[PDB]
Design a protein around this nucleic acid. Sequence first.
RNA 1: AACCCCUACCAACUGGUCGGGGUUUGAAACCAAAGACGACUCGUCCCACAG
RNA 2: CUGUGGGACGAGUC
Length: 853
Amino acid sequence: KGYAVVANNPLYTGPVQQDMLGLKETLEKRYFGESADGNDNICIQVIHNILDIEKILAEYITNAAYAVNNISGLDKDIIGFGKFSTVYTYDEFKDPEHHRAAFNNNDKLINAIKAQYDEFDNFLDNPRLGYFGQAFFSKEGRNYIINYGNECYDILALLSGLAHWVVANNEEESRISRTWLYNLDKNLDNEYISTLNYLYDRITNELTNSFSKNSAANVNYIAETLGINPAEFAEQYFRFSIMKEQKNLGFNITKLREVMLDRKDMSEIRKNHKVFDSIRTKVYTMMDFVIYRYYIEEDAKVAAANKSLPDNEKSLSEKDIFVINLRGSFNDDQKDALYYDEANRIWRKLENIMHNIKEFRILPAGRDVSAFSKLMYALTMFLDGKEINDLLTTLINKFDNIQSFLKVMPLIGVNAKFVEEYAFFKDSAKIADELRLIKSFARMGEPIADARRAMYIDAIRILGTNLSYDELKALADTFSLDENGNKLKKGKHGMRNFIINNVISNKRFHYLIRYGDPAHLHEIAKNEAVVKFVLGRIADIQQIDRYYETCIGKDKGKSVSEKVDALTKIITGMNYDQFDKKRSVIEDTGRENAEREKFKKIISLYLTVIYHILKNIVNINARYVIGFHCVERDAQLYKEKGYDINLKKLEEKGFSSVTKLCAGIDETAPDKRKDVEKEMAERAKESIDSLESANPKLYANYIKYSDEKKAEEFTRQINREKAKTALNAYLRNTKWNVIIREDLLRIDNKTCTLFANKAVALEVARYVHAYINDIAEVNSYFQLYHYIMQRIIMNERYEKSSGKVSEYFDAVNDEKKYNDRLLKLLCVPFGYCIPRFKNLSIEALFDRNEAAK
RNA sequence: AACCCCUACCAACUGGUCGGGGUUUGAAACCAAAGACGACUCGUCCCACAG
RNA sequence: CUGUGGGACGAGUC
Ligand SMILES: [Mg+2]
């Protein structure tokens, strides 16, 4: 550990790679401001990790905002730009006139605040609010009660402010853009902090109660053999249990490190199977616990001790040092060798294991955890399980990478430190630990609470159709009021329980209702081709036979295609009338529940199919949302660099302004006058003597003055000369520069702007049902999504387009399939980044998993 | 495997082979999540039916 | 407070 530990790795130390975007200096100035560009390459990687977390946050916040807007259903964006600002408290929001001093005495602002308060009151009165059971509702006793208006307004305004921070990229919008999330402590009021603390404290109290109801087991041995006081042992055991896997710890402790021991003279645990028969369990746990405790104690004593040493005498703990050693290995046997003698160096706890072999509360509340973690937990309450898992896993991985880089940097010799504007990342280890702890319980809790009449209305709509307001009476007089005109029913509500347990309790239906209208979700599900495609995808997983046996069970050999067709026919034409006519079977119980089980399985299959369709559509849309967010971020970065790019006119002129700036010399103008200026290709040809390897073959032997030299070589030299003026390394390649310049001459700014706006607004998920019956073949969700998007664009601006875009629209209308050329024209704004342009415009590199085809 | 970089051969060099690299490319190092439905084991919670 | 079934979540393999 003398002046270097693992500093010889090529990843940490190496020549400056001159990143393709060319924004490394600008990013370092904005985030660090005191780093040397040509000395290291770790700060740029940290900034890239920050950019990745910004992208993933933008995606998930856009999804959550769309879900909230869909749930509200007031034809106006409740969460958006200029609505529900975080700078206004609940008292000012409810009474803007009495608190006019806070609104800088603006009449229009006060009127807007009053309108927003009316909208918030209507949203609170909306029975659909029960879908966000974990956010706007709390469980007190048996039933769920509505939280106070202060907390609901705090949550809504915090989400709106986070959405503003996602797409602000401004200099003065009553907030500090790009750092509001990183400075929540000095920007949020006390009410928002209290609301976040209460939301965290509910779950922490539930976890403490659950642990105390089952803490009698661990206290018998963990708190006795090791001599740890039980009061300060529950937290340690909980942290060990959450972080006993390779996902969080970073290295194997139980499966490999634990078995690496017990091979020495202390093999009595494994060899003597008589006494060590029913006690090996929890003894392996004790060994893992002591190893984890030693590692975390070493990490904690190394941390908070190198703070005194400014930059040089800082040390690195064995934690993540073992991880760096493992990552340097490139073979399975090398990992075993690394674990070997590492189990011996770590074997300084001989007394602890000797005591172990003789074997036969307070939790961190919201006041201690960071505001970012509480805000992320609140955001997860608007998403669903897979989305929560993906977002939190990405966040913890990126924060772990940032922590590792920030620990490595002092050893390398980099003195770069965050300015007092992005100092939130200086404690990335605590943020990652809190995010892991939050992920440990983010899946807990009932997603839907306080089942109302509107929920059963939506359940009927997603199942049946061909009804009207008559369904209101058909629900009221059958589900809750059947004993008399208005008296509640006895324990004879089996139909209501069936509906709840088969629709409301299912998370797939919650995902559907968060992003789609149940009637529209029923209308889309009636398409035979899409259902057959989903069933084929399910079959290709390597399930159709199981579904057929559990739904249309017939003990006889049948073809897979026949079973898929039968399942499609069952799914197609789904109606609530079949369940309504057989309510007697539903209300019965016993061995005759075969029909009930078949109905449950059919409903589950239908919900699974439609949920898969919706999830694929929203993921594909979110990819382009991320792409446009990256485009806007890069536009901001290039503007800060010093290039002539207008950010205010970016939306008016389309998001291709970055591509035009990076292309080089402007050409999209009637008064070009650049061909005469680009006549330096002749001088370049005359100066070909510098390249002594090409001159004997270019114009000395293989001249071909007829067509190759004159018509082809001169044009290629002109194109290369236009390419050498590119401001980005991606477009410095002649091929990509020529492709981008050719594409820039056919794009329509209005079409690109509309496509970006509808991608951000997730407009495809609204008209997917309407624009799905006019498709000849559904090869993949990519083609489906892009055909729907092109159909929406046509329906908006068919008559307001001219040129090749009109030809592409006509081709889409005639040939019912997505247009690749139109897709390239729409992805032209992504053209400055070649991999992003190719992935988002070609149906061969878009999906990571579909690369096998 | 899309993109970028490196050694060698060749090559308008906007092209190919030979190998190596890429957390500093792209949802994109590794793990993990998703794709991906479904099955089993160990613990917790909730719901329904009974005393 | 005690039993029988279903659902959700934490941990690993197909
Ligand atoms: Mg990256």
